[PDB]
Ligand binder design. Structure first.
Ligand SMILES: CCCCCCCCCCCCCCCCCC(=O)OCC(COC(=O)CCCCCCCCCCCCCCCCC)OC(=O)CCCCCCCCCCCCCCCCC
Ligand code: HEA
Ligand SMILES: CCCCC/C=C\C/C=C/C/C=C\C/C=C\CCCC(=O)O[C@H](COC(=O)CCCCCCCCCCCCCCCCC)COP(=O)(O)OCCN
Ligand SMILES: CCCCCC/C=C\CCCCCCCCCC(=O)O[C@H](COC(=O)CCCCCCCCCCCCCCC)COP(=O)(O)OC[C@@H](O)CO
Ligand SMILES: CCCCCCCCCCO[C@@H]1O[C@H](CO)[C@@H](O[C@H]2O[C@H](CO)[C@@H](O)[C@H](O)[C@H]2O)[C@H](O)[C@H]1O
Ligand code: CUA
Ligand SMILES: [Cu+2]
Ligand SMILES: [Mg+2]
Ligand code: NA
Ligand code: NA
Ligand SMILES: [Zn+2]
Lengths: 514, 58, 73, 227, 46, 49, 43, 79, 105, 259, 84, 94, 144
């Protein structure tokens, strides 16, 4: 029975639960790696005495947080749990292929850990640029294990994307048009389209790197007429859509959380929110070379990428102002999930605005490959994704588990986290403006003060993470069972109780056309 | 060839509680066991290979 | 005693919003300059004042005499 | 170079860097305006017991939310692209210098007239002379004539590197098989520091760049003596 | 069929809070510990 | 009936604040952390050549 | 949300134990590694 | 004529950041010129300009590699 | 989009329906408090008399509470509304939340 | 009992065996590339084939034998196949991008020309043209197969499908021969790299497509397909058209324009 | 374009078979004939050890590590030239 | 030129596929493939909601093109009303 | 009173200032005296005593508006506990400084810094605003 249920699952809820467990475990790995980064930088000099190991830690930090924590939690975890419930569907379109998307991830993670254990690891950056990642500067198995890890994660998400698109297009009640589906469902749909188109380009690029490393191809090797810059194009052609992939389900959860704790039946300007996510998804495919402003590109190309990149602020602003307009006139409930969402809105805005600074290629010359970029994305991506994830987790924990969290503990956790992340990352703006490069194990002495503060901040967030674990333990230890949930009329995922039965919507909802 | 779909329909719709991957009979069980044994054995061997490869032979 | 006068009862939220968005804007436009006057104009003046009578050769000589250069003793 | 507790950019050494400073001021002003507006509005939304929970009409307010940000972006893009195209203009250099990235050091070639080339390595911490800067000093500095337009050509003989000098506003990736061009002009004599700005392996942190800017006559004699 | 309801729709037992504590400790603890031991491993290689 | 916060709130606030300030002040000033603040108005420049 | 009182209440004492055990599960192994860093290099 | 050579002048054929082709073209031009001049028993020194330009622009290792490959019979450009 | 007077008249008519049922009373009040307004005394009067026809004293008191609540920090609104309603309160024997001690925390 | 039309699938081991086969194939390629050994890889390939066989077997059992493929379930599979094909198009796009990047700006190492110095391209008017006529012909014969099936014609469906498969095999054998005859190799710089990787992935897809057609052929032999319900056939046909079109882009870009 | 054929009355199996046997397979037969004449060995290219060709950055994982997967002794020289 | 040998759905469709096919021929929708058309939704003319049990979730799109759907359990017994628009629904078990 | 898990699909009671009249009464079952009170409620409400009026209210509703909207001392616990854990973090940082970190480079020694400071002024580091601009080269001191 255990094996049938947990290894052979064809159930969207159980598979969602598997993803959440996987993602939580990955979050602990990614967090440990981040602390090692900040420990090395916490005082001037060397802590590890081995900068190849430093670079391996940085590289793994990124892959773990992106591919094993964020994507599995948002798309695999919340997507699987919530999407079928929110459209009254009995499961995903391909419930068995769904299970393979999950089971591909532990082997993918195993390949990443193998890369770090063999030889000297892959000390490449999560970008894995040749020639550093090539077979001369990184001889041996590490980089190939990294490529294979990415292959498996790629296949997992591509099949997942096919599953979500099909489910969302095909499995709504017959009367429900796409313009009657909740925003989170939209956000998963759009994310899945981005995955479907972008991951195969990455797969092509890393396959070419694999063949350069093992089959004597020279796609990226000038000796054979290749070009290291070609790899960068292929990687970032995936890599920009990827950053939008990482935030979109977050925007979706934020819309639900803000609506809910404002006591509203609906988000402000639903069609504008749909429009904004689609526009962001589209524009996300035409801006990638803003990651390459220093590689030696022509001026007109730089002017174009600067302009196209800035335009994304417009639909994004529509979403930010619509969240504010959702709060407007709300009966505000200061739940822990609401606090996460409010934190998300402001931290995402800060990071988005530093993105606009970076979009300007002239300024990016001086800011590229400095801590200003690291600060930008830890606000918009790291805080944005994590705050949306924590908001969604606290909000829907009682749905998934049937048990309540202690709200006071959860508020304490939010408070510690808010202080920690801002102490960690805010000073990194100063480090970047003043010229400290990223991907460094040590820094000229002038940079000591901000690096010291930033590392102290990282320990504060460690305390918050440890507390998060205790809080989840306390919920399961105490077993306060859910009774009534407000606003079920506009939050269908709650209407089958907590937790919902294994099989829901065996009899589908009735929705007439009028 | 004769159309024997109706016979297969009867076999696979028999009310015997068996999951589809075992509903053909004893041969399904064998093929399943072979597959899972190769997968689990191969996975253990991959772990061994990792252990071996994680250490230098200077 | 006397009766209480009839107060405004409608659009209290919208009226609050109308009032404060002007204040939200006026901070901005009132502030606008703070970064502008205290940072931007200060910076333009610092660069203008520095270079107005700047003598690069004299600057070099002071550096040379202080012993900082590999190429110039 | 950076100094302790620095918040913003290193002081500009070139006119283009001065332009970047004022453009950053302009943009950051706008960034502060927006972030504060958002913070203010958020607090406003959250500080009243008054409620209005029925359906609100979206289209009127969405015009403002789209048009004003569009205008703001144009107000950033206009000076942004002015500087971009000024950076790109033809300037006629008096001198060409090449730099080749290596693991982990820079080499320099000045081959307009004679074959002058040398390697440039970080001074190890244990060998710093009193008052010298940890991780920043090199054995052989890039000596260059001040107040002159210099063409820098940047490449690599192994992995990617990136040749940067923040106070001149310079960062040009060093790519094997490719010859990237940038222009360099210092308004002042002195020493101007930079660091490798593409991850190139285990000593990425330890291959800095030091420019030494002096009068032409000194540059010429130094050049001759370096043959 | 399967057990349904709170504490039953999960692959781990919550029947005893102390056994649960031990399991959550091993689970999150192994994930957090792993990078430190990978670093130790790499340092010990030379 | 008074809840947890009614009974212990004042004490948790007071002790929490006192403990936090004391330990951070101690960590910041007493254990040899080198913050490397600006030389400006602090350091007397000394002959190096 | 409303909920039932805890089926198996977790007292302040039990919370202190769960919290302490949790923090130690993160701190001790990492602490052990970091404390012995110099031993790993000098080996 | 244009002695007082300082450095390679701007070339409108190669106005962008990537100057690889500029170095390459001048290298080719110099050696083609030298070969054409020697074939006709003429003054090689009319080719000098291209040598100055490619010497200014081209990394030493590229020139050196190209020279080795011309001597080896493996230079892939047409001369 | 109709005057204030037309809005009020519609609502008065809503609650004045002789055979208004419990569901329609709840629907009315719960919808009305979603708007950016404190309902005029004449709306509330009509809603209170509906409570009377529905033999529901408690809902009458609750309606008075929600009037106070919708006014937010505008402390002058509720005492004014109660003032205007006093003849109805007296006629129907409706005690205010305050008179019942239901304003105590 | 359900009153929707969707398929609740029996708990299945094949996702896990599939995932493990992926681990075994990738760790196996690693072992092959670095530790001079083929064992893990061979086990991975074997378990992969076993997984695919039993998984698709079960899909056939679920549909032909158990009747779970209602119109709503079939429609889902249509979207699924279309989306899979789109992902495969983008995969090839990355290789076409690599080809155009290299060939439009040939570096000095190549002689600054395309095709590079020392490269003697195949004549696109010889076997590559034959290949083109073969796959185009196979697009015509597969359409004949589809119409015969819809018209209830068992014999002509089988004949047309057999012809299509024979053409697939012919292309595959022609390509294997051309690979052997080619005077340039995968190690001949970016020309060899782009040529063999792009046409090689295409060749793999031709093999996959041919196999899928063969599966349909044997299912047809066994009367699985009705004149109205035959999604496995549709789809093998879509995938086959996809493979044809990729060929046409390869022929135009690499063989013709890049010669 | 309408090709130059011109059928359409009902798009059926008969029409597609007509196209298979009347156009598609005859084109293949023609191209097959065409190939069967321009077949035969084109002379093997003289060996020049160009550095952009015969790339070896890592030995191949088969044979002696120096032979490509579809190595053809007649036309594929090694880095050191044609095999003896 | 053209014989038979290919089975039809009528001859060979089985299980749920066959049920759906046979019910569609009768103009029936027991597996909820079609959106039901609304009545006037008064208490006299309620929307009739079939169910195989004693309760079923209703989603009410109160006005055409509303993006917000209003969801509630409809129980066996007297007609219930949408909490947003008041339109009436009544469960008809089976 | 007693709400059960298996009742999730039924209309439920809630106290919410934006939903004043919930779908069901707080108290569903009535005792003999409570039944008599509901009968009395059908006659003039002026004949009801204050206690009877309160009892009728409490049958219909759980908490009053004033009760459900009351402020709490929770913020004290939240802020205090947050500060406690932030304080606990400094203990980990003290441990790290003592047991993990070794000495920082010699370049942070006071004499080094003084010499390096002079050399930075000699090379006129950030002479427009940042560093050397704050040094008075005439009076040989930091500007006031
Ligand atoms: C952490 C250490 C801070 C140290 C600050 C040094 C003091 C200035 C020296 C006192 C002045 C001494 C004279 C030196 C002037 C040098 C100025 C310069 O040459 O260069 C320019 C400087 C100028 O910047 C500053 O001048 C820093 C001010 C910080 C901006 C406001 C953020 C809130 C305050 C920060 C502390 C909280 C941290 C939590 C982070 C919060 C996230 C924003 O460098 C930057 O570009 C900073 C990059 C920030 C870009 C992100 C946008 C942030 C938007 C958020 C608004 C929040 C609303 C407040 C309301 C906030 C409520 C939440
Ligand atoms: C969540 C993930 C995420 C998101 C959403 C974004 C959003 C954006 N990012 Fe970011 N970014 C990353 C994650 C993300 N980023 C990562 C991981 C990297 C580096 C990877 C690496 O190198 O390892 C990166 C790097 C990166 C670079 C490259 C810098 C460099 O390496 O030199 C650039 C440059 O243009 C960029 C720009 C932008 C812009 C313009 C947006 C915009 O979409 C933001 C739009 C939002 C706002 C502007 C705020 C809200 C709007 C309003 C309140 C309206 C009014 C505002 C205005 C009118 C301005 N980012
Ligand atoms: C008739 C055409 C059909 C092709 C069938 C041939 C077998 C190879 C397999 C095909 C798969 C194609 C892509 C793999 C890339 C390389 C093979 C390219 C095709 C090929 O077969 O190229 C051959 C070289 O093969 C070689 O290296 C052999 C190397 C074989 C090992 C391949 C390494 C595995 C690559 C991993 C694939 C990653 C997949 C990613 C999936 C995406 C996940 C999202 C050419 O021979 P040659 O002697 O150099 O030149 C001819 C000289 N007479
Ligand atoms: C050297 C080779 C090694 C590489 C490994 C790959 C090997 C080859 C695999 C060949 C693909 C075989 C797929 C066979 C699927 C058979 C099952 C099937 O076709 O199932 C059909 C449904 O379609 C469905 O699931 C559709 C399922 C579609 C499957 C998609 C096939 C493409 C798979 C490609 C996989 C790798 C590609 C990526 C490579 C980089 C069943 O419905 P019907 O047909 O309507 O029948 C019902 C009627 O009888 C009722 O009257
Ligand atoms: C980035 C992550 C941050 C982690 C912060 C860690 C905070 C500290 C947790 C305690 O860790 C323990 O510290 C002891 C020292 O205090 C170590 O004992 C060591 O030192 C003792 C005293 O010298 C000896 O008794 C022991 O044998 C010797 O193992 C012990 O191994 C280690 O587990
Ligand atoms: Cu060289 Cu980084
Ligand atoms: Cu991007
Ligand atoms: Mg870079
Ligand atoms: Na360090
Ligand atoms: Na068909
Ligand atoms: Zn309705």
């Amino acid at each position: 029975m255990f094996i049938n249920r947990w290894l052979f699952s064809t159930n969207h809820k159980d598979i969602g639960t598997l993803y959440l467990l996987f993602g939580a475990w990955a979050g602990m790995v990614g967090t440990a790696l981040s602390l090692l980064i900040r420990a090395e930088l916490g005082q001037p000099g060397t802590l590890l005495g081995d900068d190849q190991i430093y670079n391996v830690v940085v590289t793994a930090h990124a892959f773990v947080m992106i591919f094993f924590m964020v994507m599995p939690i948002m798309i695999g975890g919340f997507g699987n749990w919530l999407v079928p419930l929110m459209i009254g569907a009995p499961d995903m379109a391909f419930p068995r292929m769904n299970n393979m998307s999950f089971w591909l991830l532990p082997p993918s993670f195993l390949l990443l850990l193998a890369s770090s254990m063999v030889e000297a690891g892959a000390g490449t950056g999560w970008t894995v640029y040749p020639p550093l990642a090539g077979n001369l500067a990184h001889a041996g198995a590490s980089v190939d294990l990294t490529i294979f890890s990415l292959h498996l994660a790629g296949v997992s998400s591509i099949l997942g994307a096919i599953n979500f698109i099909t489910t969302i297009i095909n499995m709504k009640p017959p009367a429900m048009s796409q313009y009657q589906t909740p925003l989170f469902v939209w956000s998963v749909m759009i994310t899945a389209v981005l995955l479907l188109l972008s991951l195969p380009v990455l797969a092509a690029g890393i396959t070419m790197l694999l063949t350069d490393r093992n089959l004597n191809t020279t796609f990226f090797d000038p000796a054979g007429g290749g070009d290291p810059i070609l790899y960068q194009h292929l990687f970032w052609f995936f890599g920009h859509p990827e950053v939008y992939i990482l935030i979109l389900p977050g925007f979706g959860m934020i819309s639900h959380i803000v609506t809910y704790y404002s006591g509203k039946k609906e988000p402000f300007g639903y069609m504008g929110m749909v429009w904004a996510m689609m526009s962001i998804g589209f524009l996300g495919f035409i801006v990638w070379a803003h990651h390459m402003f220093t590689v030696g590109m022509d001026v007109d190309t730089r002017a174009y990428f600067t302009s196209a990149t800035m335009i994304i602020a417009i639909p994004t602003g529509v979403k930010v102002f619509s969240w504010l307009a959702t709060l407007h006139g709300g009966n505000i409930k200061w739940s822990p999930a609401m606090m996460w969402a409010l934190g998300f809105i402001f931290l995402f805005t800060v990071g988005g605005l530093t993105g606009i600074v970076l979009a300007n290629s002239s300024l990016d010359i001086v800011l590229h490959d400095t801590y200003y970029v690291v600060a930008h994305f830890h606000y918009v991506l790291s805080m944005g994704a994590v705050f949306a994830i924590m908001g969604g987790f606290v909000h829907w924990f009682p749905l998934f588990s049937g048990y309540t969290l202690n709200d006071t503990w959860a508020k304490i956790h939010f408070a510690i986290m808010f202080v920690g992340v801002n102490m960690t990352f805010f000073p990194q703006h100063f480090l970047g403006l003043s010229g400290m490069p990223r991907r460094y194990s040590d820094y000229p002495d002038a940079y000591t003060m901000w690096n010291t503060i930033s590392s102290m901040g990282s320990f504060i967030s460690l305390t918050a993470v440890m507390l998060m674990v205790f809080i989840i333990w306390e919920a399961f230890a105490s077993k306060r069972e859910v009774l009534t949930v407000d606003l079920t009329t506009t939050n269908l995922e709650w209407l089958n109780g907590c937790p919902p039965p294994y099989h829901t919507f065996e009899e589908p909802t009735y929705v007439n056309l009028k | 060839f004769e159309n024997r779909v109706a016979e297969k329909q009867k076999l696979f719709q028999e009310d015997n509680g068996l999951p589809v991957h075992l509903k053909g009979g004893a041969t399904d069980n064998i093929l399943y066991r072979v597959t899972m044994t190769l997968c689990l054995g191969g996975t253990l061997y991959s772990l061994y290979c990792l252990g071996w490869a994680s250490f230098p032979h200077k | 005693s006397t009766a209480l006068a009839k107060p405004q009862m409608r659009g209290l939220l919208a009226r609050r919003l109308r009032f404060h968005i002007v204040g939200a804007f006026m901070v901005s436009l009132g502030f606008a300059t703070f970064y502008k006057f205290a940072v931007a104009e200060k910076r333009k003046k610092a660069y203008a004042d520095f270079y107005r009578n700047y003598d690069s050769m004299k600057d070099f000589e002071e550096m040379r005499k202080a012993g900082i250069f590999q190429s110039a003793k | 170079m950076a100094y302790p507790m620095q918040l913003g950019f290193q002081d500009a050494t070139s006119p283009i860097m001065e332009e970047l400073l004022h453009f950053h001021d302009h943009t950051l002003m706008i960034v502060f305006l927006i972030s504060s507006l958002v913070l203010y509005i958020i607090s406003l939304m959250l500080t009243t017991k008054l409620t209005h929970t029925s359906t609100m009409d979206a289209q009127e307010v969405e015009t403002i939310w789209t048009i004003l940000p569009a205008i703001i972006l144009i107000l950033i893009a206009l000076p942004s692209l002015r500087i971009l195209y000024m950076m790109d203009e033809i300037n006629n250099p008096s001198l060409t210098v090449k730099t080749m990235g290596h693991q982990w050091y820079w080499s320099y070639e000045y081959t307009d007239y004679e074959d002058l080339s040398f390697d440039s390595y970080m001074i190890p911490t244990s060998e710093l002379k009193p008052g010298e800067l940890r991780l920043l000093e090199v054995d052989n500095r890039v000596v260059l004539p001040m107040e002159m337009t210099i063409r820098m050509l940047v490449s690599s003989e192994d992995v990617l590197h990136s040749w940067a000098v923040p106070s001149l506003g310079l960062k040009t990736d060093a790519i094997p098989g490719r010859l990237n061009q940038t222009t360099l002009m210092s308004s002042r004599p002195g020493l101007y520091y930079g660091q490798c700005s593409e991850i190139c392996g285990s000593n990425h942190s330890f291959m800095p760049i030091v420019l030494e800017l002096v009068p032409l006559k000194y540059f010429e004699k130094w050049s001759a003596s370096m043959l | 069929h399967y057990e349904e309801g709170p504490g039953k729709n999960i692959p781990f037992s919550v029947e005893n809070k102390w056994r649960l504590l031990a399991m959550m400790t091993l689970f999150f603890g192994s994930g957090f510990a792993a990078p430190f031991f990978i670093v130790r491993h790499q340092l010990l290689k030379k | 009936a008074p809840d947890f916060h009614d009974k212990y709130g004042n004490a948790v606030l007071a002790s929490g604040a006192t403990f936090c300030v004391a330990v951070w002040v101690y960590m910041a000033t007493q254990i040899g952390i080198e913050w490397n603040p600006s030389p400006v108005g602090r350091v007397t420049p000394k002959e190096w050549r | 949300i409303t909920a039932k009182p805890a089926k198996t209440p977790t007292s302040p004492k039990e919370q202190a134990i769960g919290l302490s055990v949790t923090f130690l599960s993160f701190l001790l192994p990492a602490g052990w590694v970091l404390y012995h860093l110099d031993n790993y290099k000098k080996s | 004529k244009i002695k007082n050579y300082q450095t390679a002048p701007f070339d409108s054929r190669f106005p962008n950041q990537n100057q690889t082709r500029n170095c390459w073209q001048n290298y080719l031009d110099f050696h083609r010129c030298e070969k054409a001049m020697t074939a006709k028993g003429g003054d090689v020194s009319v080719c000098e300009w291209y040598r100055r330009v490619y010497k200014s622009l081209c990394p030493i290792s590229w020139v050196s590699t190209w020279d080795d490959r011309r001597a080896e019979g493996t230079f892939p450009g047409k001369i | 989009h109709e005057t204030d007077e037309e809005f009020d008249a519609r609502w008065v008519t809503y609650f004045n329906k002789p055979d208004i049922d419990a569901w329609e009373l709840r629907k009315g009040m719960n919808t009305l408090v979603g708007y950016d307004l404190v309902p005029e005394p004449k709306i509330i009067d009509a809603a209170l008399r509906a409570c009377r026809r529905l033999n529901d004293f408690a809902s009458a008191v609750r309606i008075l509470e929600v009037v106070k609540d919708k006014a937010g920090p505008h402390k002058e609104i509720y005492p004014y509304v109660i003032q205007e309603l006093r003849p109805t309160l007296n006629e129907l024997g409706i005690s205010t939340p305050e008179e019942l001690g239901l304003d105590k925390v | 009992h359900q009153t929707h039309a969707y398929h609740m699938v029996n708990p299945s081991p094949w996702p896990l065996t599939g995932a493990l086969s992926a681990l075994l194939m990738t760790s196996g390629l690693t072992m092959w590339f670095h530790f001079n050994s083929m064992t893990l890889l061979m086990i991975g390939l074997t378990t992969n084939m076993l997984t695919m066989y039993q998984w698709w077997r079960d899909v056939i059992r679920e549909s032909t034998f158990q009747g779970h493929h209602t119109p709503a379930v079939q429609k889902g599979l249509r979207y699924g196949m279309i989306l899979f094909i789109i992902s495969e198009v983008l995969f090839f796009t990355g290789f076409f991008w690599a080809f155009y990047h290299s060939s439009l700006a040939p570096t000095p190492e190549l002689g600054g020309c395309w095709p590079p110095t020392g490269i003697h391209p195949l004549n696109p008017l010889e076997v590559p043209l034959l290949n083109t006529s073969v796959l185009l012909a196979s697009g015509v014969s597969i359409t004949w197969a589809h119409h015969s099936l819809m018209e209830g014609d068992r014999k002509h469906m089988l004949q047309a499908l057999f012809i299509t498969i024979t053409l697939g095999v012919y292309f595959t054998l022609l390509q294997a021969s051309e690979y052997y005859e080619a005077p340039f190799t995968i190690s001949d710089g970016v020309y060899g790299s782009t040529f063999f990787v792009a046409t090689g992935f295409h060749g793999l897809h031709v093999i996959i497509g041919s196999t899928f057609l063969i599966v349909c052929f044997f299912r047809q032999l066994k009367f699985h397909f009705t004149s109205n319900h035959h999604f496995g056939f549709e789809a093998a046909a879509w995938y086959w058209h996809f493979v044809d079109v990729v060929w046409l882009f390869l022929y135009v870009s690499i063989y013709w324009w890049g010669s | 374009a309408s090709a130059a054929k011109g059928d359409h009355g009902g798009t059926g199996a008969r029409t597609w078979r007509f196209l298979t046997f009347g156009l598609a397979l005859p084109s293949v037969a023609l191209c097959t004939l065409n190939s069967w004449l321009h077949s035969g060995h084109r002379e093997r290219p003289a060996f020049i050890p160009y550095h952009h060709l015969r790339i070896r950055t890592k030995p191949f994982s088969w044979g002696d590590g120096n032979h490509t997967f579809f190595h053809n002794p007649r036309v594929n020289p090694l880095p050191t030239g044609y095999e003896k | 030129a053209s014989g038979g040998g290919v089975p039809t759905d009528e001859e060979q469709a089985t299980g749920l596929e066959r049920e759906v096919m046979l019910a569609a021929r009768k103009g029936q929708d027991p597996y909820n493939i079609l959106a039901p058309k609304a009545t006037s939704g008064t208490k006299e003319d309620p929307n009739l909601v079939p169910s195989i049990t004693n309760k079923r979730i209703v989603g009410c799109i109160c006005e055409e093109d509303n993006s917000t759907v209003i969801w509630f359990w409809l129980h066996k017994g007297e007609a219930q009303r949408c909490p947003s628009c008041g339109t009436h629904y009544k469960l008809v078990p089976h | 009173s007693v709400v059960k898990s298996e009742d999730y699909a039924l209309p439920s009671y809630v106290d919410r200032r934006d939903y004043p009249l919930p779908d069901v009464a707080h108290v569903k079952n009535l005792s003999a005296s409570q039944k008599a009170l509901k009968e009395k409620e059908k006659a003039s409400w002026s004949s009801l005593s204050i206690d009877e009026k309160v009892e009728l209210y409490r049958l219909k509703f759980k908490e009053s508006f004033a009760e459900m909207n009351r402020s709490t001392n929770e913020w004290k616990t939240v802020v205090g506990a947050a500060m406690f854990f932030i304080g606990f973090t400094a203990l980990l940082l003290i441990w790290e400084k003592h047991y993990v970190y070794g000495p920082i480079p010699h370049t942070f020694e006071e004499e080094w810094v003084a010499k390096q400071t002079k050399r930075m002024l000699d090379m006129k580091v950030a002479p427009i605003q940042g560093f050397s601009a704050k040094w008075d080269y005439d009076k040989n001191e930091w500007k006031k």
